[model samples]
Target chain A: QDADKLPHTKVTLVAPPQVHPHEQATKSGPKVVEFTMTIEEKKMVIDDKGTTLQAMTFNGSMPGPTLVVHEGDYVQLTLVNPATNAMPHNVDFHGATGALGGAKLTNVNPGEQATLRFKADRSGTFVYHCAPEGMVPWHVVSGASGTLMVLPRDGLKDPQGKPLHYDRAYTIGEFDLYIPKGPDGKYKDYATLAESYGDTVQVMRTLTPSHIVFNGKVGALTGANALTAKVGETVLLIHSQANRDTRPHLIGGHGDWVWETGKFANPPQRDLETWFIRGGSAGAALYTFKQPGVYAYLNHNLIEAFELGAAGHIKVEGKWNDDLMKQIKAPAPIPR
Target chain B: QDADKLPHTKVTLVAPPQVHPHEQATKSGPKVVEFTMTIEEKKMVIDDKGTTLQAMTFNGSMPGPTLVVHEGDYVQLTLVNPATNAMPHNVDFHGATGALGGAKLTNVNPGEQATLRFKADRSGTFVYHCAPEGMVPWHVVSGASGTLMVLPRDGLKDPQGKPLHYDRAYTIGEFDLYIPKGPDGKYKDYATLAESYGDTVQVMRTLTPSHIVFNGKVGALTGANALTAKVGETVLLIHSQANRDTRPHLIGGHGDWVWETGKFANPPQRDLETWFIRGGSAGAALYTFKQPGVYAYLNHNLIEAFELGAAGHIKVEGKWNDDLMKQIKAPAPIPR
Candidate 1:
């Protein structure tokens, strides 16, 4: 398919999802990159209540490591479904072009692997999740999801084409789990992937989740694990809710710049209190905290943020500007 | 029904569960979403010929009442956990964020209530539920769930930010209810039910539920309760599952714009045969009911559609536009 409405020919392999304080743009010259994804499973607790789940992870984490590349870059992916695993798995990247986002050519079973090549012809933050027929919801909610981003070879820009920059860039992958508990009053752990399937679909149908967490576990992005920044620094937070829809918001702040659909080809929207992130999709938000305090960044859907598990902490350090805000009459009675 | 039903209230609620859309805007112009969740530990029957069970509810309803708001509106929730209830409770909004969507600070004790305010901030159909320490899942699946919508204040938009309009919108809250029976094969009472947590846990772990319903009842959205529509008009259908996940398919139609995760902030996926709505969240699908027949809307899982419940209807009326889909030969057998 012609991506970005451009001729889809050259495959310019771009950057990895990894980032610096703030990632700005693509290189002047494109480069080729090979990304590897290993389908792995792990037994971990999803909540503080000792709720254990055998998370089917990408690259060992709930959301496989973020994949980054330059728009127009050719993206080559090596998908591995280890023999230790049981179910057949594949990936579909919202950021790639052709091969059904790679799902068509990436199916792998236990001890098997496949290679897929595509042109990252467009720049944007996008979600990549498992696309097995009857097991999409089950796989995604269980953790077989991640983010893939394509940076325009030049740089970032607003609708008018003015350049945009950020001081920090962070990837926040959100997940909602439906882990079922056993007779022992704890989340059950199955010996095989299929053992959990019947149970997983049951819970999936409920649409009420047991945990809505970030990067895999409850409070993974909160408390000591929160991201930090300076008051004046622009931060780009990429959020993904692989299996459910979400609204990302920064309490006490706004998405000064938001690409709600992850497509940078279209100009970014400005000053949004919250931005929408469709399920099976990834989007980005850029905010510069004006105040010096702990800022709570979360899914605007509060239950998922506060209860189910989607919450992030951004510790901003700087001087407070009383000029910006102040106590008019601290604790004074209202002239009774 | 009046032709002028939807007034683009508040920010512009283009969809439902219906709301008295506020015709306000920014600053004092801001839209407000104010609702009270009255927590109650009560009793109710699960069927017409249903057995009585101790029902944990919000506002006395199993799935509670659906609240509506447009994106960017300020939402004020007065959570009342009356002393009449047996446990401490807090409300969690899947469509909200910060302070556990207010659950953290607003953990209303019995007989107590708290007011929490935040911007609707983002648009999407989301799930709301009670959140305490450990029982999040049991709380949601045992009832205590509801729906919330944050419409894009200005209205929905297409991929290019072009205004996308809808004629009428409706909400279908899909719930897969689980009813545990007593030795006599009847629904168990509350006290005895609590005594069977072990057995209940066993069943819950199996992921094999007893019932899969719409709007909290088997036939709640069917028969006489069916939604009404006109041909040639776009209708937005919001679907939600609080504790489990589902795949919703509109028979004889297609989701012209499906926000599988319910967030309109992102571009809605187009022309979906069936869309996935993850558990503990809400999503929307907009369709134009091309042929105007009795359309069956349901979870594509045939068993749930045919055996359990999870089915609804949209009775649309209009002349056939054969240019869209024409029946050339009806019930024609193959010539041998």
Candidate 2:
């Protein structure tokens, strides 16, 4: 297929937790979906205490963006590395077929840009990240990754072939940050990626992350930025972790339909208490609010959730159902 | 379901990576499958260097033997804490319905035993671990865990309702060892679980494992212990991690069918490069070897597989098919 002959459509990417409007499935002829992204290298504060990292990002976000396209469609991505940037960059699409998921053909140095296209033949949520020749892991763990989702032409179907629908969708990018500590026993602040490279590599060798976060930082998806939903509204959560294995669990809820491997061609597991997302890949879960409350969406590894900062919240608005769950009594003195 | 009225059968247990024979599915009435496990608290050597850990185990093995029963059957477990043991223990079946998966009813101090029966209502691979009140993580990471698999009454099936079968099955229990170091900077040796308790808990607090092994120790499932298979035979690999998320991958092979979440009620994902086993859970994967060689079955995280020692080998007996993979050129210097 000559991709140039296909109809081209430019898509404006949105920030994390906010998925761009997309069809549940497409029935029309495949088109070339064009997305332009720029490399942003700067300092990012990852916690309440102002711990900063010399972060490298895509489109000025820790995680690039959630890209949506239909299976059989062509994804034309124009990746730009501005002159102000310090390192070379490329994008590796786990969804793309060959040539290192387009990384081999799309390497661009500072002050350069490259356009690469690949067919979205697989239907699933996939991790796409920077895979420059020498420092793939460093670039990825430094916040240079995102997700791309390809929907089936006919849309999602249950095991019985019934169609599945979602009222809203979100993208949660989980990151494991490895920051080197200075002689003073504080996370070191670096003026450039090069300055942080050697020290960062030493910490990476230990395989112990200094901080594990959601979206970009500690509370990126909590309080005011919490995901919103109404009762009976189903939300699809697409989770991508470019460099560490993680389990996504929704406290006070369940995954009504979970694509733990993120592949839609296979049937989604039903009613999972938690779902696994393999490192270097993405998975998804669909859930509908059953009662109104603050639902914690956190990594199931309790240590990571409570201490390492991999937690989020979803504010659900709806009437509580007593039948499903009821408080029999409040905390009080126990009977002797 | 009055489980008390079910027919009872006592089965002999086998050591892993060998799995006891189980029917793929059954049309007969549900029965009470009985098994006995004993708590063994002793020292274990975890690596080639003979680093000893004051290990707490079930049935005297790092990970107790894998137990299998049909869905809807009653699993009657008689867990014993021998007087030789220095600590109390209990079994928590992740597959059980309530009461901390039978942990509450099965707590036993040294020289005591308790029998708890729970209906296997769920069909999947689940983790069974020691959760003795205050030291759950310490006990689990010290290797007091195993897997329980409940097969569907009608047996395993494909998404299309076709039957799926395996010629052989093996269980891989992954353990993240948090051995404490002494003042000399060496892994400490302790005389008893009580002696090792404080130091092990301190290391566990770091959430950084000093060693991660398959089955029981480094090379436990390699060299002479390598799992065996035939090219044409489909082998089922059941992986369990009681306290950490892991990604299992088969080099030069793909998961022909993977129950990433391990539930038979859910359809298996197909052709995954790596399947995830969430912490506190187990997942199953099926593969039919296509070539002959030592296939590395390891955690996808390279550091854990290579450095921390979470790896195993599968030696397949078969002819190599060059069509599937080939080396077209001999290793030589590239033309300048």
Candidate 3:
């Protein structure tokens, strides 16, 4: 037994504590950010067993991919639409400095890719989605887009003029679509965006949606992709509704600062009542975990969060107050 | 021991099947049905234990209570608003013949009950929500409203003469309002809806939900409420966007017979596509649950359903005959 078992040794470990208010900045006066987003047609499941598959995805993700940048950054996005039975697609970056650029960079047909560039002069949360005019709304509703966060030039600031350090930044959005289930129990491409007319029978009779999702699939964050948070650390949640309008409610916590229109408000409001994110709009909220435990992040639409699995948990480590742990305990908390 | 357990066996099943669907006739030509609903203010937990506290309810239940009746029936709803809170409450039955009666019949200041009657001249799915005008939408969003179903006429026949039968029915709607959470961690008195607009700081700094629901809660039915079905059995689905115009979609199924505009269309006109149920409008669809197992009922807006929890399920129980099932499963099976 002794020979088979590996030798075990105990050693004292000491690590320097990281300082708060860490600041990261771009060295150049005006940085040019080139972001390549491949709008690919991928399959995903959005049900209980995660078996409802459909041919609706972007950049191999339901909500495409996030395009992150800084204020005043000249942005160039190349959208590669690989053929996969999806209709013509394009990008409408909500953060573009011009008139959405939808009219110019619209409709990238199958097997085709298009490149569009714009100046990210706006320092706020924005959405980049398919912009095919009539079919734009439908494509977005079918999960053909995602969010873009253009950080402020001064970087995020706290009330004390300190750089707000966040443990993580995640994109949150809601998708509503008529994804039909294929024979293999996955969401299959039932109809094309062009085929889904807002005034047609197939569209009307198909009004009952099959799936509601967050980050592409139902419960993507809750079970596997759950966002993590540590006590006393600030978390920045970039909430976006790429398709439909929604009210994102975070339970058990309040945002310290928010970028409602992609720009932080002057005088800095505190204790927000509720964050209202509309369709094709995005917002950002910063919060610090006070207690160490799991908390739910949801749309507050209660039913849909549970149904579409558009929910996730923030796992907080350590105990509340450090001394409160010895008070008492009836049941041990789950691992989440 | 046997004698003691006998009491459990002898317990007569009470409470009337949780859901009660009634059919009655009216004094006038259209059938008049009477529905007794209980209004109670109680504490409840929503948002997966994230929120817990007191909430006003209709029929002592959330989403109020369902009222079922046949088409051409006169409907009378008696609301008993027991005094719990200081605010005066009333009912606005969306399915009523008049303008929700303007809270005339059930204008109980407090601790009073009143009766409201209406002729069910139209046959379709409708929503009954609070109609106190200023506070109605908030009340409905706060769990004061419920769904009302007016079944088709007894002798109603699809173009094929098959009797209409809905495997399941649910309501879909949107609510845009501000609900403040009280100290008890529950949504308390609703902030003035108009105030939400005036307060720019409140509006811009936080997530103000302009879209409320899809089926019931924000995103409740994504996984659990999917409608299930079997081959050949008729599945009827009734939908209503109580307050907002919505494009409804059924992910995996299509409507075979749709009663558009209170009129039956056999082999429903081919061109009649999406069932556009405008805000303040309702619709009904009859489709055979041709496939088996679970299906999803969602609003095409997707996010609205997620925001308001306006999603549900239709479970179809039966076996799939290999030949017939395979045939029905073929592309464009059983053309309308």
Candidate 4:
């Protein structure tokens, strides 16, 4: 009888915002956090192979701006559906409770808008996506998905009960797209969801994604766009794979602390070589660079990262750790 | 420096034996745990749909018998390649240390057998699979995989150091297979790996599997073969998916403690609706039943579990709890 009775949580709907530094939250601050989301449809480049996606997106980004909140804070959200959008969309927060993850109360039609409010009663990184029944999966694969992080009010802690802090945090949003490519080899852009339905299902049914990207664009986080870090600094790497499964691995680093499901209340695992991020889920890993080098952080399924376009790099600028690793000889030839 | 030196450990190579109960281990007893794996090829029923697999397997099982041992125990294994086998094979234990996980030391050709030994050294559940030079993925998908569990000698404890015990444990092996069918709509069989190379690669290259099964075949562990346990039993479920990722979820139960990556030395997270098992990796989860009923354990990617044949059922016999879940009304129309 008591299952339905609990502490009442107040919620408000505001516009979405970007993820900020940890200093954004304070124990004594406002009880409500506001975020806005603008839904639209646009032609965007998805991969280095010249595939362009006529993506259904939230806010202008494929993985919309990350919604960050603090535990016990009210998440006030404003959802706007721009007139240019071809389809109606609503936001579903995986980490939120009640009202169908805020989708039921926040369904916005094309050129319309809505508001919602809920309590971030728990702490974790979560994947939020579009939920409009028939076109839900279509909207998601077309890029109407993003991440939300609820931070514990008191901050984070290590496995040994010691308080943990990060020098910087990078949000690597992984997406596996199934856009159809024409005989010309470039992705075909459809005028509307209806026009693309038959062809999109053909690819999705095969369960083979044509373009797997990071942070919306192909190679968006690789080479010249690689993330920057320094030696001996702990970086919190938050990864979200909204439409498909992924393995986030660091070539020459370790997940010193890994929250496989991105839950802060759960005890963190330690020293992992690679970590799993299932579809519709987001995970967080903490890594302290033990050596200075260009670290390739990508999906370990080498097939996906190399064959598809899901690859990234982290450029670390600092002194090399000879104590950790050293070459005895450099490309010396063997005498017969 | 002391860094290059090794810890004192005893190793012995012996023919493999089945894993007995946990009580069989004692520090003073056998210094080694022995297991033997015979590489063989067989025609096995893959699903209810008249699909049979000319599968390559360890012993006679899709996932060979799970190897269980205590941490720090020496794992002595013998790998035999029967003459009937089509190709050379080797075993790689993810739980073992050194020599490419004992793969290099135990490569066996047809009609040959090799023995190797190594220390468990750590506590966790791990995946062991066939890792020959070129056919690793193919050999694995054809059922050359199993799980190895190295338990802490002293038993398990919660993150708070509180002792935790299980009444029983179940090992669930999940596989995603890609079998090709001829124009006759029947699966094609081959005498050797070479004969099946072209056909297998065609399906595998698509990254879309034809069948995803549990414990070898579709519904193998369902219906009459369903796992049975009394109500309120603590069941430790160790899950392994060697060739693809899986999300193991209980229809109406929770993972009370989850080792998302299968590491026991790491602290387990709590209360997960679905936990991920990455390809080439194994994971462990512990759950205690609070009520009684038949529960469907499956991959949360509903399409895979429902359509692709990756599912199992656990029948829990006990009195029902109306308070936990109740059918307040029979099938009737709601008032207009």
Candidate 5:
């Protein structure tokens, strides 16, 4: 009965305004350099609180700090790994072409402070993770990873002929695998990303999975992460998949255009089945959620929608007209 | 490329063996047998002839037929649904009084067939269907359906047990859903089942899927239709599923015991995953294939297996021997 009242916490990290990918030099002449990252070490009750332990993280977060930078700027990141009851931790900026923020060179010891610098020259979305090999995928999957978006020097354009602007931007992906729980309901040692794919003894043990998540929980999109779009403003969907393949279906509206692979398709691909994306890949679609209501966004793989917890919604609120309502009600029936 | 060498003219009907469910009387015996089932239907290029219409089967046959009989006698069956073009398929004789045919029902239906049957004098073990819905869950995501069982005079055993013979017997279940093909190589469609789950429409226009299957195919393993199995020898592993719920994992190896809900505990429980008998119902594990070579069976979710032709094999050879090669040199792990 209390299924809906599960407790949750949100931690947001903003990326630096600019950084170069390959070169280490800054573009400006003289300017004051001030950078700060807010780190929090919070406790999460996975099952019934029978299991709890300190997990190493940057900015007190599992997935380290988010590094946001523009097309050509140097980024100086100061990481503070607060004292924790767990082991030591470090961060590997996948987006930084300069020795991955020297993560390959130096390691961050627990309760210690480390400063690293790099230039974000590339344009695209990348994941910054811990690079300790055996503990990497685990740390990332545990929320020890944050996104890095290097905005185009000029600006972003919608697949359609419009400029892109949004009140907020959020990323979505699928994490498919068995999350073993101790008797206390907290995540025990999670199966490696490979073990989840019918490989190790774990597959034979619990072939049936227990929990599935999207951005961490079942109802993630409803309350906090709900994608909000104004009636006529086009929203860009930079969809991604961390683990399994999925077809994200938008229940109430149609996307205006879709970018295939990475390039924008001219004239934009029209309405599509859930934005199709496979494991380890990403895609972009532009849709101006025309109506004002809450709509569900789900992975076409229904069971995964429930099992893996990949579901969210878009809340649209504005004035409504009869003609628009007619168009909404009379949207062409999806071809069978 | 040798990829073209894979046989394609294959079709299978998934369903269990033994007592036909819900068969009323025509003065001859019961007429209306209420059975449950699950199946799948897939469109593939058969012999390079372009997409051919093929359906998954319960016992590896189409339109799963039914069985007719007198009041007292042992029901025997031998199931075979080869893995010619797609995934494996097995059967479970839900209609059988005691002996439930599990993987022994594993038949390779590469343009071939197998058999299995049971006696009806004492009712029970009435549902049948394909159990391998995991390979491609959507094929038999839904659609497979069948009936229950009715007894003759003298009645039947109250969950009676005989000297456990075969290796194992586990309950089996099946599910079927419409998965059409698209440019992305995955199936796409739009129907309540399709749209409710956000199925994509392929870039290429295609035909819509009409019928769905459960355990057996469209024309096999229905009412009166039965696969065959022997007594005193074969070790059976009856695996069942409701396509959604968990089924008891019955093993015929040492003791005729079930591993409650397919979640095999080190020390198994009296019954494994709870067995649901309906289409989206149950799965169980029971053993019956005496002297094994091959056997035929179904999930009792009969229809879907037939639609996509879900069928396979379990080649049982050689008796148990402690001296036989039990272990092999472990191979070096290959880097991805």
Candidate 6:
């Protein structure tokens, strides 16, 4: 096999809501990009009420890590299922072409590991999730998904071939959880994945989510952990929804350019108040903050954003321009 | 006012699943497009199980009727609320600039009517729905909505500025219903809109829909009512959702050109497998049938598509192209 001739670069993936640094690599030839991930099964508290989830993750994070590579690069992944885990797992890359997005070739039971390589030929942001033989949806809803962005060799471009750049980037992964209620009128807690399977499936079959959260919990991306930006900074927000359709809206802001379907080959829509992210897909939005304030980035479904916790905050620092918006009048009594 | 000076045209609207015809009118100057719609409140059976809804409508049709006009044209609408109806209502044009999409100035009580006019400055497929103050969501979910398409002066063009044309056009309006259950656990029935308000709002608070249907009912657009097309005919499908986000996919076909956000000012995306339509908005997709078969157009949420009735049928007539797809082998026993 003439496979021993290409250059290899090992990438150490960062945790979510964070992304690993990457370059356009336009001048670089096709090479192998290696990434390693270990599956972790553990308990995660999803809200302030101490509700627990028997969560499954690619790297101990709810959304796993966002991986990046240039188009035409070879993606070599080493997936490990430690002996401490119970279930068999494999990944289904939405951007990949064959073999069930490499799921068929990379099934690994507990205490086993498998390596699979596929070429990143498409340029877009895509969702990658755990997909086992009979429990694919269960695995994905239990937080076994992540995002991968395959950039073009020359990087992102506008419709006119003008290059567009971002000063900062972040990935927001949304999860719709279906936690079963016990006879005691509280969310049920389980000790193991097997113990939680039947009840979780029952609730999942109803197709009604108990909670729709961002990152991992209700306040994971809020308060002190809120994303920061400047008034003049352009931020790239990559949003992924693995199991349910979502409408992402930045309150008091707009998406200057949005790849609503996540494909770079398609021209991004201009200045959208809200953009749709289909279930099982990810979308990208670029916005430059024009004023300084706490912008509430949330699902446009007001119920989901306010009550179900599908929200985040972006804190931008700079001066507010009165030309864009100003209070000409305030609350006062009207004259008769 | 200069109301008597402009050229005027009175248009008769058609029912849903069918759109009224209009020209690009590139050379035609601004004109007053006059349309009249009466609010009809009645009962609608949503599925085969005889689940009834206290539905409200414009022009006696669910999703009202799609209206077409050119940019810079004035839309003058006469909204009538008959004395037989119980509730007050108004129209909110998503494409309008002020007065809550004209909702503020057009409220009408029973036995009354109101006429409002606004310039159609934006070119896009926009949702127009009834907003009766605090019950806007309930009104929208009860099928009091329609679509307005404002065409550009020059009409649609490709990213390269090539003009695009369509042979037929249809509108698919999606509804997410929240019906309450009686003591017997069967769907509750109500004699009037007032009788259904409380229980319906209770179910709506859960954010889980009892049914998701297309064009008013489960089988409305399937079987005998399926849309038809020829292999070489390009059809423009305008999908609207007044209260929920949806992903529209044409099984066995692709969106040749899609304005995912519904604005013609932006370039359409090329060849989309599925497109997203945000709540309170409408999007357009153009596709040319390439094969002869029954194609299922669905809200790609599998559970919703199969169980909750968010699907339609398109019967395309033509010869099958083996070169596009062929079964090289039939089902056979695996070799040991």
Superposed model 5: Cα runs more than 4 Å off: A1-43, A46-66, A98-102, A158-167, A172-177, A181-209, A223-225, A238-241, A259-270, A277-284, A321-336, B1-140, B143-336
lDDT of 6 by residue, A1-336 (tens): 123577999999998777888885378878899999999999899999999999999989989899999888889999999999989999999989999999999899999999999889999999999999988898999999989999999989888788998888899999999988999989999988889999999999888888899999998999799999988899999999998989887755667789989999887887565688989999999988776777668886655766678889888899855433322222222222
Q: Chain A: TM-score in each candidate?
A: 0.89, 0.98, 0.77, 0.91, 0.67, 0.97
TM-score of chain B of 6: 0.97
Across residues A92-136, which tens digit of lDDT does each residue of candidate 5 receive? 665577665456654555577676656666666555555554555
As a TM-score, model 6 comes out at 0.65
Q: lDDT of candidate 1?
A: 0.69
Q: After superposition, how far is residue B120 of candidate 4 from its true place, in Å?
A: 7.9
Please provide, for model 2 over B27-97, each residue's C-alpha lDDT reduced to its tens digit, 9 standing for 90 to 100. Answer: 78888888988788888889999899888888888678999999778888778777777788887776664
Clashes of each: 51, 0, 89, 16, 232, 0
Would candidate 6 be rated incorrect, acceptable, medium or high by CAPRI criteria? incorrect
Query: Looking at the true structure's interface, with contacts defined as alpha carbon pairs within 8 Å between chains A and B, what fraction does model 5 recover?
Result: 0.00
Predicted candidate 6 versus true structure: per-residue lDDT over B1-336, tens digit per residue: 243467999998899899987885378888878898999999989999999999999988877899999987888888888888998888877666434456766788887777777777668888788876556668888888889999989888888889998889999999899999989999999988899999887788688899999998999899999999999998999998877889999999999999988888897999899998888578999998889999999999999999999999999899999999999999999978
The count of backbone overlaps in candidate 2 is 0
Sequence-dependent TM-score of model 4: 0.62
Ranking of models by lDDT = 6, 2, 4, 1, 3, 5
Query: Which residue pairs of candidate 2 clash?
Result: none
For all predictions in the order shown, the interface RMSD in Å is 10.0, 8.7, 23.1, 9.4, 25.2, 8.8
lDDT of each: 0.69, 0.84, 0.53, 0.74, 0.40, 0.86
Tens-place lDDT digits, model 3, residues B234-292: 64555544434455566567766664332232223222335655443346566765556
Can you give the DockQ of every candidate in the order shown? Answer: 0.05, 0.09, 0.01, 0.07, 0.01, 0.09
Query: Each candidate: RMSD to true structure?
Result: 9.5, 8.6, 24.6, 9.5, 23.4, 8.8
The positional error of residue A314 in candidate 5, measured at the CA in angstroms, is 2.1
Q: Taking the tens digit of each residue's C-alpha lDDT, what string does model 2 give over A84-174?
A: 9878888999999899889899989999999998899889999999998888899999999999999999888887899999989999999
For each candidate in turn, the TM-score is 0.62, 0.65, 0.46, 0.62, 0.43, 0.65
Top candidate, metric lDDT: 6
